[PDB]
Structures are given as structure tokens and as C-alpha cells.
Amino acid sequence: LLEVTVANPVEGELPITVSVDVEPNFVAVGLYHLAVGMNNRAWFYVLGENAVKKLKDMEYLGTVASICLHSDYAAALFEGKVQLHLIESEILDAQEERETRLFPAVDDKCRILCHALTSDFLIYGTDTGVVQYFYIEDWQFVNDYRHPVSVKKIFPDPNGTRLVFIDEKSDGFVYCPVNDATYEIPDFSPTIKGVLWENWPMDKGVFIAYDDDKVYTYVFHKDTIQGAKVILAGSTKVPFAHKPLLLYNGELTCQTQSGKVNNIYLSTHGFLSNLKDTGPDELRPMLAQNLMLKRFSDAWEMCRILNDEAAWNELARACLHHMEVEFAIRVYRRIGNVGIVMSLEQIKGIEDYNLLAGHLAMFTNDYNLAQDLYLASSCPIAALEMRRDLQHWDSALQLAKHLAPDQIPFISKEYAIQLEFAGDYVNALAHYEKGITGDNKEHDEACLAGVAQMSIRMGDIRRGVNQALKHPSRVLKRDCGAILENMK
């Protein structure tokens, strides 16, 4: 009733029990502080290593719905308004304008439904659907996003930039202020009570959404060939009355009803156990899970355990899909695929996002997506090149009207050549006569010879022999004699 246990098992800090004055209604813990409170009062304690000492018992105008702590700042949400202030409010050459502020502004007729506090920002969502970032260091709003519907809950990631918010319709979105976009979370359960971001330093995209029944593991694919998106990775049933507190490297420190924490191993992250005793039929789903979570190092380790070339190809395709050129180079080099290794090392130093996306899409044999990415890049003509390299002369002609019109004749002639070799002479004649230039004499002569042959095979024998006479090349006469023998 009167105890709060604060511990950092990951860093090895021993649990510290603090006896507070009153039975708290809300409990929050920051880097250097622990704020426990009820009604309109909140007691702040400094979490010293040896022991703690309460600084103040601050008063708030309304009923303190919630509070958030980080660094030396505390933001208390009460009565639809967030008061952001310092905790060790030392009056020592400290400006008054940054010591305390109230959100929203006095003119704004909106209520704050959810607020959060990262190492740099005061993030809050309003009943009008407004998500606003407030850079504490410079005391200025940096982001204003207008969601159509009010944002009921916000959960920033440990990096402090990317957010996950749930609105009235129980629709979870992942918000990225950097490119300033929202990606809807697939399969978001309507009754999800909370969201916990992954705290392991090398699992940036991973997060979980928990309700009273299951814990769903989602992953945000910030950089992929097919654009950013959220992908549901798995689900894990949890026992009765287990509200998760912490998520570290796939282990969930969840709070029970006895005031004792417990550790639950996620089904998606169930590979933390031993891998030698596990059979390949059990590793394959494990490998799929590791690939989905972008855990490429563990995927490599488990592929090495499998020693199955199909698994290595699966890992490498996953690496290419996630714009990881270096690791894909590693996997292909281990497999032995020389040509694709060299092709990747050709594009190893590419920086344009869309150009590299198109390259890695073409490497995976998705030419429509590769073209779509190439056109959006800074080197659009590359698309034409691959369409020219794929003998897609119709598509090459379609593109060359915009990118490279000087290649319009040559490509057209090549098209007709294919049409000639496919027996579709009618279009071959049209593209031959459409492939004529005014500078390349040899190209013009070849196109004229093609027009002559086609016109001869059109039954337009007079015109065909007419162009036959006016071409300085005995080989055209040689083949045209055979063609006339074909028409006898």
C-alpha cells in the first residue's frame, strides 16, 4: 500500500524499496526521479544510488490524471491541461519562462487526452486530433500533426522521435515526424490497453501492443523496398492480471497482482533459449521469426546452424528487401553467388533512396516496382536502361518519350527487329520507318533495308523493290532475292 519498488535489473541496479507518505493513485519513474501522487498532490523523490530523498510535494489545480518524468522535467496532465515544470526548481540564474508552462495555450479550446515525455520533447495528443512536439531544450514547438480523430493514447519510442498513437476508433498508427507520416498498424485489436516499445538497442522497429488476453508483437519497417509499413510479427498469450512494464531483448517484465514482477518470454522472441538442441523443423519457423523482426545477425547464426542453402537465400532476400546492402553482400558472398555480389558492390556507394530502392528491387526480380522506384529517383533514365536491358522495347519506347528522346529511333528499330523475328512484319515496317534518323548513315541504311524487306513482304512489291534499288549494299539484294523466291 505504501511501498514503491524501483529497480534496473538490466543495468544490475539492486531493487530499492521506498516507503511513501500516502497510498499513491499514480506512479511514474524517470531517469533521476520517482513521482507518486493522488488527487491533486504529487510527491517527487530523487533516486539516489544509495538511498532516496523526497524533494517536494507539489500541488496541481485539478485532479492529476497522470504524470510523466524525464531528465529534470515533469509534465502533469490534469483537467485536460498539461503543466510542464522543473523538479529541482533552483532559483540560481534560472530564467522564469522555462521553469513552468501550461499546455495548451490559453486561446486553444482543446483538451489534452494523452501526454508523454521523452528525453527532449513533451508529446501530447488533444481531443481535436492534434499531436504536438515541444522541444524542451529550446522551448519551441517543432511538430504539429492534425489527425482526423482525437488521439486517445500516445507511446513514444525510446529514441524519442517515433510515436505510436491510438485514436477514438481504436486505430493504432505509427507516426514519424521526420518524414511526417502515419502508417496504420495492421490487425490492431479494438481492446488494446497498452503499447510497449522494445528497449534492446538493436531492435529499433520492434514494439508490442498488449491487452488483457494477448500480447501482439509488431515491427515497423522504416526502410524497405516496398516503402515503410508496420507488419504484425506474432502473438503471445499472457496469464491473468499481468500488466507488462518493461520489454528488453524479447523478455517482458510484467507486473502481477502481488506487487511482484515476473518475466515472460515472447513467442516471437522465443529463440533466446539454446539453439543446439533444436531441430531444423523447429529452426525454420524460428528463422522466419528472426527474419521478420529484422534480426539479421541472429538469422545469420541460425542459418549457419541449419547449413541449408534455401535458408541462406531466404535470409539474403530478406536483407535485400530491407535495404541492407552490406549484409546481403555478406550472405551472397558466403553462398557463392559471384555475379550478384559484384552487382551489389557496383551499387554499394549509392545514396539516393529511390535509386537504391529500384536497384535492390531489380535484384529481387520485381521489375514493375523497380521501374516505379527508378522514375521517382534522381536518375530516371536508369529505368529505361533496365527496360532496354530486359528487351522490353515497347516499355522502353514508352519511357524514352520522356527521359531520352534521342534513343527513340534506335530502340524503335530494335523493337521492329524483334517484331521481324517474331513474324509480326506489320509493326516491324512501322517501327523501321519510325527508326529513321538524319545523322547516323549506317543506322538509316539499316532501317531503309528493313523497310524494303517489310514492304516486299507486305505485297507492296513495287515500293519494296524501289527501296531495294536505292540502297548501297549488295547483302540487301542477296537476302531480297531469297525473299522474292519465297514469293516466287
Instruction: Summarize as ranges the residues that interact with another protein (CB under 8 A).
Output: 120-121, 133, 135, 137-143, 159-161, 177-179, 204, 223, 323, 326, 330, 333-334, 336, 338-343, 345-346, 349-353, 356, 362-363, 365, 367, 370, 378-379, 385-386, 389-392
CB neighbours (10 Å) of residue 273? 9
Closest separation in Å from C-beta 285 to another protein: 26
- Toward another protein, which CB reaches closer, 101 or 284? 101
**Within its chain, how far is the Cα of 206 from the centroid?**
11
- Compare residues 391 and 440 and give the one whose CB is closer to another protein: 391
Cell numbers for 45: 523523490
For another protein, the closer CB: 47 or 357: 357
- The distance of closest approach from Cβ of residue 322 to another protein in the complex, given in angstroms and rounded to an integer, is 11
Smallest gap from residue 80 Cβ to another protein (A): 25
Do 485 and 479 touch, CB atoms closer than 8 A?
Answer: no
Residue 475 CA to residue 170 CA, distance in Å, equals 76
Count of other CB atoms within 10 angstroms of residue 480:
19
Closer residue to another protein, CB minimum distance, 210 or 300: 300
**What type of residue sits at position 53?**
K
Letter for the amino acid at 121?
F
| DSSP H or E stretch at residue 236 | strand 229-237
User: Are 391 and 417 in contact, with CB atoms under 8 Å apart?
Assistant: no
Contact at 8 Å (CB) between 268 and 231? no
Give the separation between CA 456 and CA 459, rounded to whole angstroms: 6
Half-sphere exposure of 299 (CA within 13 A, CB side): 25
How many angstroms separate the first and last alpha carbons of the chain?
108
CA distance 456 to 88: 96
C-alpha cell at 166: 491510438
Least distance (Å) from another protein to the CB of residue 319? 13
Q: Which is nearer to another protein, 54 or 98 (CB)?
A: 98
Nearest distance from residue 254's CB to another protein, in Å? 28
Q: Rounded distance, CA 56 to CA 71, Å?
A: 16
> How many whole angstroms separate alpha carbon 129 and alpha carbon 132?
10
Minimum Å gap between C-beta 139 and another protein is 8
Give the span between the Cα atoms of 6 and 138, in whole angstroms: 31
CB of 51 to another protein, least distance (A): 30
Judge contact between 224 and 214, C-beta under 8 A: no
Residue placing its CB nearer to another protein in the complex, 236 or 377: 377
Identity of the residue, 406 or 485, whose beta carbon is nearer to another protein in the bound complex: 406
Closest CB to another protein among residues 226, 346: 346
Cα–Cα distance for residue pair 105/82, rounded to 1 Å: 10
Residues 364 and 376: beta-carbon distance below 8 Å: no
- Of residues 55 and 335, the one with the C-beta less far from another protein: 335
| Alpha-carbon gap, residue 29 to 8, rounded angstroms | 11
Q: Which residues does residue 83 pair with via DSSP β-bridges, in sequence order? A: 76, 102
Q: How far is the CB of 53 from another protein (least distance, A)?
A: 30
Q: Which is nearer to another protein, 63 or 378 (CB)?
A: 378
Determine contact, residues 225/361, Cβ cutoff 8 Å. yes
Least distance to another protein, CB of residue 132, Å:
12
Least distance in angstroms from the C-beta of 325 to another protein: 9
43 has which bridge partners?
A: 36, 57
Output the DSSP codes for 290-337.
Answer: HHHTT-HHHHHHHHHHHT-HHHHHHHHHHHHHTT-HHHHHHHHHHHT-
Residue 51 vs 142, nearer CB to another protein: 142
Please say which residue, 206 or 252, places its beta carbon nearer to another protein.
206
Asked if residue 188 lies in contact with residue 236, where contact means CB atoms within 8 angstroms, the answer is no
Q: Which is nearer to another protein, 173 or 363 (CB)?
A: 363
Q: Where are the beta strands (DSSP E) in 422-487?
A: none
Minimum distance between the CB of residue 273 and another protein, rounded to whole angstroms? 22
Q: How far is the CB of 214 from another protein (least distance, A)?
A: 31
**Least distance (Å) between residue 116 CB and another protein:** 15
Is the separation of the CB atoms in 374 and 380 below 8 Å? Answer: yes
